Amino acid sequence: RRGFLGAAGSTMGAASITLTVQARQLLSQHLLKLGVWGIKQLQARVLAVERYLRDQQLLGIWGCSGKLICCTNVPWNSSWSNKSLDEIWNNMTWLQWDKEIGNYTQLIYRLIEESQNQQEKNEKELL
Amino acid sequence: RRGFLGAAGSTMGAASITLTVQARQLLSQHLLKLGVWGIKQLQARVLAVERYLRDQQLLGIWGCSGKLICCTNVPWNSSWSNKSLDEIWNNMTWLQWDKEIGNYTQLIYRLIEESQNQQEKNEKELL
Amino acid sequence: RRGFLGAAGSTMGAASITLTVQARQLLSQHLLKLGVWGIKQLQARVLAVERYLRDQQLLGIWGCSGKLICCTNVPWNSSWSNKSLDEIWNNMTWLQWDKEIGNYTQLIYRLIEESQNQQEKNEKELL
Amino acid sequence: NLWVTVYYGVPVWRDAETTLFCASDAKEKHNVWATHACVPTDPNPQEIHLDNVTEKFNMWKNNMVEQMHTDIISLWDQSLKPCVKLTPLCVTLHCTNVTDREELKNCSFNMTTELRDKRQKVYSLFYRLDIVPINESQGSEYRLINCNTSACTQACPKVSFEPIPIHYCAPAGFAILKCKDEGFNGTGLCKNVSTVQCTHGIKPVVSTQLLLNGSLAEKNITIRSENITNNAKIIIVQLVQPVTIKCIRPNNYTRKSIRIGPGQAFYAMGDIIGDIRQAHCNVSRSRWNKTLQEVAEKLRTYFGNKTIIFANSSGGDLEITTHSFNCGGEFFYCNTSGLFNSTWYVNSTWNSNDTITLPCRIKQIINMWQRAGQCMYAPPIPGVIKCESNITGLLLTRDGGKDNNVNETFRPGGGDMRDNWRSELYKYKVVEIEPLGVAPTRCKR
Amino acid sequence: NLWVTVYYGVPVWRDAETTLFCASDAKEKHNVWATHACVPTDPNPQEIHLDNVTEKFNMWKNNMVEQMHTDIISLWDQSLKPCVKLTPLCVTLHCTNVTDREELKNCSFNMTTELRDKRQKVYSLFYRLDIVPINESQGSEYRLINCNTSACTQACPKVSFEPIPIHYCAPAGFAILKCKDEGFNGTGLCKNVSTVQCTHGIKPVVSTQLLLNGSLAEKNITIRSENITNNAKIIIVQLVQPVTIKCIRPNNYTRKSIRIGPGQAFYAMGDIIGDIRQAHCNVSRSRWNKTLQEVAEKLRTYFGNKTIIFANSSGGDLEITTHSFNCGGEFFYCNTSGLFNSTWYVNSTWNSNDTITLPCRIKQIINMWQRAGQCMYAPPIPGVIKCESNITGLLLTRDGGKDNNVNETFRPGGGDMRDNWRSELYKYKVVEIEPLGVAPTRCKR
């Protein structure tokens, strides 16, 4: 069992087994002098909280809060990536895939939003 | 599709289809000089996180975290509002509804809290 | 109904009925002068957010976010504590139990992580 | 039956107060406002028009004007904090007339140097307004004004007083409501509301009796006042046509730097090239008094068929009795008596250049926010300087007479410095959005 | 079909910039770096090796070297803020030779005291480099250098200049990537990457022309430069064997404290015990001229069969023309002409003690970061002081030849202060991890 971020070189299928080791480290003297070093630490602590909440709020609206893996109703458009399933989950790594979907990452984020919001209003709010 | 807060004039029934657009904007130089402008930005950033967590923690205890809409076991007491289910959702808007339930908002919050807590201990904690 | 932290002396079974009263108080002038008192308040406000997120993130990875009580797949090892299920829930209080599992608290926390991630990969990620 | 349901992200709001942060197109020579230290403004800010929405606005009870006033004052003090403090300048000054033309005084005085064991005798011109006689030697001994109250801080020559626009943004979870109603007077229910995350470019142009480089009215000359019938309340009038005003400092001084102490120097005006010339401001007479007729007739709507009379400021401090501004380095003080000097009857019509000339005075020792002490010394700008401004508003004051007469007089009142900001923030209000909502519905089916 | 699925905690990252905070074994006397005010370092820092991973590194475009430079400068100013400012020291100094040996000057001068209505005449020795003659009076009436630019602040004697190691950590959600490739030249794709939350112990040892107490090369003498063929780019060479250098200040001065004002005193050098002696630094010739051959042959790989020639600096400021360092209190300035004086042919081989002696100068008034003004006065350390340093790197500069010669000349160049930090941070880079990932899979079965 590797440490934090140790599965960066493993394939996609083998990298999902350690998700908890990277998710747990996203946030890990009582007084503060607010000096040169104190100011930097204060900004680091605030910046860390914002980064955690920035990614956490997305999961909240998407309906996947508290879940390391979740499936949504947005189908996979072949235009984003035409590669098969066997070569993506058993041959390619996450780093190489990140630079391919970066162009369509923003569109996919928005598509997952109303896809969940519409489902909420369709199932709930009977009248 | 209107932008942020664009459905403020629509009725309650039609304003609920854009909840995600308002929920997404609740949190939206690396160094900080801590000057006149820097101090204000720091307070604004900290204040924004607190406001988001202030409303998010309520959903957590209510058992509705990660849900845009959720139904609780607290029945609707007619004393709070006698408006019919038709005019309230198809004719009246949220802004007019906020000033009517403002008097009973705190009481409703406490009722939902104990209702969820009692149900949690009743189903879970077999012995 | 006791106030905040009023059920500290009651037994375990009776103390779990008031969990919401302690969970609600975990986070409870717009301008800031950043003086002697202002600096302390800023640190206190930031420290409170970090403490809340520190415990909240653990529930997130454990898959229990938004739940006051939850059961995991980790079986109870008698080595940690051989006390019976009756005396523990009807005679001992939470304060006395805390000093007993303090030695095994961290080990149990880690054991709940892969127990949830493995389940997620087994149910989700069909291929 | 019906069950209670909670909604997250509901579009509702309430009046609130928060810490608004700056936002501007960052890029360079620093400025007194320290705009380079704030967040960079977005290139395409989003603005949404709220259909079917009407909201109440109160420009006089708004918190943005009060909050902005403190920020501007704080920035002014922050910029002057690292600059050299002119404490040794409080010395006896021996002045004589320059070789009316008595606006300047050729003063000579002793001064310190980088060597603590040595002194130096220097000379430099000084405006008569920034000089006070000691009276012990009658007319040949003087001292700097406000020297008996506080030591003025020399403004750093590396920072400019250019009022670049600054956008006031609200933190996340809040919003700035904008009123798009045509000809809104700044108070009441707005029938055309809109929302935006940051306000438009607000230029902190400090001015008195005349709003310069401000926003222009959309279709008609708008008048604003919390109680128009009251006499002590200032009247804000917005113009639709920008009245161009050209000011100039014809004197060509030679900047001279003298080291008063180790690593710090004092800048002052040396001799004048050519001859002395009075500073002034020009303005078209045809276009200027034409607006007065439009302003007079608009004002007539609030006072019946009475005539409108414009008179110069009653009297008092130079800051409030004269149109004060800054040509990016030099603080002017022009007499507006040539403008607010006329009477307009109910049928009166205004009916070439004939530009009106306004004499102006200049000061180096200044108190921007009417505060005791905390004075600032503006260093001289070398060469001739010229600045063109757009007059888009006026600050008027109504005399407290019996009001039973057939006429009513108006005066250019300085009012309060907050009025300058209030003339631009009247269209905005900060509100706190409440995403959490509660409503019933027949759920659990 | 296939459905989109989002993954939280994905092991991916991107280049980024963040506010790195200090970390050290804080515990006691304070230091100029204020290490006691930062987070305490962990006892067993975790380091992970990324198998199958290769990453690109660029020591010249790294942001850590730039960020560290600002922090070091900020800490230097912060430590000098509460110390007494030597503003009254700017007075005429009457000096005479001490009772070449003209390196010191016995100066006498007037000075203030606690009683504002009284003065005092004192005397103290001053190095010839920290004194400038007024030129109005020959043979006397001198003044402190940089007195006409800024008042130097006396360094607090209670804080030491010891460069204890400081670890640079990244905030949560970010990480530092370390390159473990053997003999990595600092640029390109690293074939052996590793990750760590905090960098190793970085000692802010300020030095010029030679890197002291720095990291040592793993197996071979590594050379680094953004463009080796560019004559205007500094060349950083790392040694595998540390060349010990012994420096000493044989003069035994007597520290005398004089109260210049209420509650503050000025420390200066009193008379010297014994006789005057020149400060110097020793280094083994056999071990020193050995490495030059290894450095010469390594440099030969980038210039064909051309020979290597080493020459002293081409003149300029004392900071860049001499090997400047600090023996924990005294700033040395040693001439390196005795080291970079040789020529090495393609076959040339280097082939007892015979230690090389380097004469050195000492200064009290210093400008660490080449900034105008902001000078500092280093108080004298009583007694004899000795400091041994490990030479692990050199800063070289190649002359702009015509490229047709049969040799290449190298000079010890001071370069920029950032090069000192860049020599230790070349192995690190900060990246922002993106735990949110998106990929498809046949879910919803």
Ligand SMILES: *[C@@H]1O[C@H](CO)[C@@H](O[C@@H]2O[C@H](CO)[C@@H](O[C@@H]3O[C@H](CO[C@H]4O[C@H](CO)[C@@H](O)[C@H](O)[C@@H]4O)[C@@H](O)[C@H](O[C@H]4O[C@H](CO)[C@@H](O)[C@H](O)[C@@H]4O)[C@@H]3O)[C@H](O)[C@H]2NC(C)=O)[C@H](O)[C@H]1NC(C)=O
């Ligand atoms: C209402 O708004 C108007 C329009 O913006 C303002 O009018 C401008 O005022 C500014 C000063 O506040 C003027 O700027 C100054 O102009 C001078 C002339 O510039 C010409 O010459 C220079 C070369 O010297 C050319 O580069 C330039 O293109 C012009 O042809 C300069 O002397 C000044 O330079 C100073 O500032 C710069 C920038 O910081 C420094 O680098 C210089 O060293 C120097 O310090 C300066 O640029 C501007 O010209 C005015 N415009 C017009 C059209 O008149 C009003 O001031 C404003 N009113 C109020 C009350 O705020």
Ligand SMILES: *[C@@H]1O[C@H](CO)[C@@H](O[C@@H]2O[C@H](CO)[C@@H](O[C@@H]3O[C@H](CO[C@H]4O[C@H](CO)[C@@H](O)[C@H](O)[C@@H]4O)[C@@H](O)[C@H](O[C@H]4O[C@H](CO)[C@@H](O)[C@H](O)[C@@H]4O)[C@@H]3O)[C@H](O)[C@H]2NC(C)=O)[C@H](O)[C@H]1NC(C)=O
């Ligand atoms: C590269 O790294 C080397 C090795 O770390 C550095 O060499 C050390 O330099 C420091 C100063 O920077 C020296 O420390 C000083 O040494 C003096 C002698 O100490 C001896 O005597 C004491 C008392 O008996 C013993 O405890 C000690 O073991 C030694 O036998 C003292 O004068 C100093 O102490 C005084 O100053 C310090 C700091 O202000 C105070 O805390 C003390 O209370 C006291 O007032 C101090 O300890 C050290 O000796 C050097 N070591 C060697 C082996 O030479 C190089 O300086 C460094 N190079 C560069 C360029 O940074």
Ligand SMILES: *[C@@H]1O[C@H](CO)[C@@H](O[C@@H]2O[C@H](CO)[C@@H](O[C@@H]3O[C@H](CO[C@H]4O[C@H](CO[C@H]5O[C@H](CO)[C@@H](O)[C@H](O)[C@@H]5O)[C@@H](O)[C@H](O)[C@@H]4O)[C@@H](O)[C@H](O)[C@@H]3O)[C@H](O)[C@H]2NC(C)=O)[C@H](O)[C@H]1NC(C)=O
């Ligand atoms: C404010 O008041 C101050 C004085 O308090 C005014 O400044 C002085 O102005 C006078 C004229 O009013 C200046 O004197 C004039 O200078 C001219 C230039 O002289 C040139 O030649 C000199 C040659 O040297 C001989 O002369 C000097 C004395 O000037 C002797 O020391 C030498 O030994 C030689 O004999 C040069 O020194 C000089 O630099 C020039 O090259 C000239 O037209 C006249 O002869 C006359 O002397 C005087 O220099 C000014 N002083 C200072 C310190 O600036 C100031 O103008 C007043 N300002 C206003 C706005 O009225």
Ligand SMILES: *[C@@H]1O[C@H](CO)[C@@H](O[C@@H]2O[C@H](CO)[C@@H](O[C@@H]3O[C@H](CO[C@H]4O[C@H](CO[C@H]5O[C@H](CO)[C@@H](O)[C@H](O)[C@@H]5O)[C@@H](O)[C@H](O)[C@@H]4O)[C@@H](O)[C@H](O)[C@@H]3O)[C@H](O)[C@H]2NC(C)=O)[C@H](O)[C@H]1NC(C)=O
């Ligand atoms: C830099 O230049 C300064 C001067 O500008 C030098 O400092 C002076 O150096 C001289 C020469 O060394 C010192 O004078 C010498 O002092 C010796 C010690 O004094 C002995 O007598 C003292 C008492 O007698 C003195 O006081 C009484 C009144 O109380 C008078 O009547 C006497 O005449 C004497 O002044 C005792 O207190 C002391 O313990 C000794 O017994 C002595 O050997 C010599 O006779 C001679 O006078 C002089 O004191 C120094 N001045 C100061 C202010 O420190 C300095 O050395 C130069 N530095 C360098 C590096 O060259």
Ligand SMILES: *[C@@H]1O[C@H](CO)[C@@H](O[C@@H]2O[C@H](CO)[C@@H](O)[C@H](O)[C@H]2NC(C)=O)[C@H](O)[C@H]1NC(C)=O
């Ligand atoms: C609310 O006020 C705005 C002010 O901009 C009106 O904006 C219209 O904008 C379009 C597009 O630029 C113009 O072509 C129209 O002429 C503007 N209308 C007018 C009347 O000037 C907007 O119409 C107003 N809304 C309502 C409902 O009156």
Ligand SMILES: *[C@@H]1O[C@H](CO)[C@@H](O[C@@H]2O[C@H](CO)[C@@H](O)[C@H](O)[C@H]2NC(C)=O)[C@H](O)[C@H]1NC(C)=O
């Ligand atoms: C600004 O306009 C509002 C209306 O939009 C004016 O308010 C009215 O003032 C009159 C004065 O006689 C009152 O009778 C009305 O009841 C007021 N209406 C409301 C809705 O308050 C206000 O006076 C105007 N102000 C100025 C300075 O012209």
Ligand SMILES: *[C@@H]1O[C@H](CO)[C@@H](O[C@@H]2O[C@H](CO)[C@@H](O)[C@H](O)[C@H]2NC(C)=O)[C@H](O)[C@H]1NC(C)=O
């Ligand atoms: C506006 O100010 C006027 C006075 O300038 C107020 O009207 C009356 O003022 C007199 C004194 O001049 C008071 O004695 C009366 O009580 C005022 N009238 C009333 C009805 O209170 C006027 O009230 C002020 N406010 C408004 C909204 O016009």
Ligand SMILES: *[C@@H]1O[C@H](CO)[C@@H](O[C@@H]2O[C@H](CO)[C@@H](O)[C@H](O)[C@H]2NC(C)=O)[C@H](O)[C@H]1NC(C)=O
């Ligand atoms: C202000 O005075 C200065 C100094 O006399 C003038 O600058 C000179 O202008 C002449 C014009 O022929 C040039 O030849 C000189 O080289 C300029 N410099 C000097 C040092 O003499 C400047 O033109 C004057 N400005 C105005 C508006 O009159």
Ligand SMILES: *[C@@H]1O[C@H](CO)[C@@H](O[C@@H]2O[C@H](CO)[C@@H](O)[C@H](O)[C@H]2NC(C)=O)[C@H](O)[C@H]1NC(C)=O
């Ligand atoms: C990557 O570089 C590291 C540098 O430490 C190599 O570390 C090995 O570490 C073990 C344990 O200390 C040593 O016994 C080995 O000798 C080191 N290897 C070498 C080649 O020196 C590590 O082997 C390198 N990894 C790869 C894949 O080359």
Ligand SMILES: *[C@@H]1O[C@H](CO)[C@@H](O[C@@H]2O[C@H](CO)[C@@H](O)[C@H](O)[C@H]2NC(C)=O)[C@H](O)[C@H]1NC(C)=O
């Ligand atoms: C450090 O090593 C890299 C290769 O790992 C060198 O990269 C070369 O850079 C030059 C610059 O002109 C290019 O022309 C070459 O094509 C690069 N080579 C490769 C293989 O990419 C780099 O020059 C080296 N730097 C030093 C100072 O030796």
Ligand SMILES: *[C@@H]1O[C@H](CO)[C@@H](O[C@@H]2O[C@H](CO)[C@@H](O)[C@H](O)[C@H]2NC(C)=O)[C@H](O)[C@H]1NC(C)=O
């Ligand atoms: C590195 O420096 C070399 C020169 O040492 C550059 O190569 C050429 O340099 C000559 C001058 O010696 C210039 O006139 C040419 O334009 C340069 N070539 C090119 C293609 O620009 C070289 O470009 C520099 N940069 C790198 C990345 O190697």
Ligand SMILES: *[C@@H]1O[C@H](CO)[C@@H](O[C@@H]2O[C@H](CO)[C@@H](O)[C@H](O)[C@H]2NC(C)=O)[C@H](O)[C@H]1NC(C)=O
């Ligand atoms: C530097 O000079 C001083 C002053 O003479 C010497 O201090 C000695 O310290 C001891 C401590 O026990 C005293 O007993 C002596 O009286 C002092 N003087 C002498 C002459 O020994 C100090 O030792 C000198 N240092 C060096 C390296 O020579």
Ligand SMILES: *[C@@H]1O[C@H](CO)[C@@H](O)[C@H](O)[C@H]1NC(C)=O
């Ligand atoms: C798939 O992507 C292409 C290319 O962007 C686009 O034209 C098409 O509409 C997309 N299809 C769906 C169903 O989203």
Ligand SMILES: *[C@@H]1O[C@H](CO)[C@@H](O)[C@H](O)[C@H]1NC(C)=O
């Ligand atoms: C409904 O509200 C009324 C008025 O507050 C109150 O008396 C009554 O007890 C409430 N009923 C329930 C069931 O909460």
Ligand SMILES: *[C@@H]1O[C@H](CO)[C@@H](O)[C@H](O)[C@H]1NC(C)=O
């Ligand atoms: C239970 O605890 C004991 C004592 O630590 C340990 O040896 C044993 O392996 C544990 N069993 C399990 C199933 O975790």
Ligand SMILES: *[C@@H]1O[C@H](CO)[C@@H](O)[C@H](O)[C@H]1NC(C)=O
């Ligand atoms: C609100 O505006 C919408 C959009 O034009 C319109 O359909 C609706 O009828 C309006 N409602 C009212 C009450 O004016």
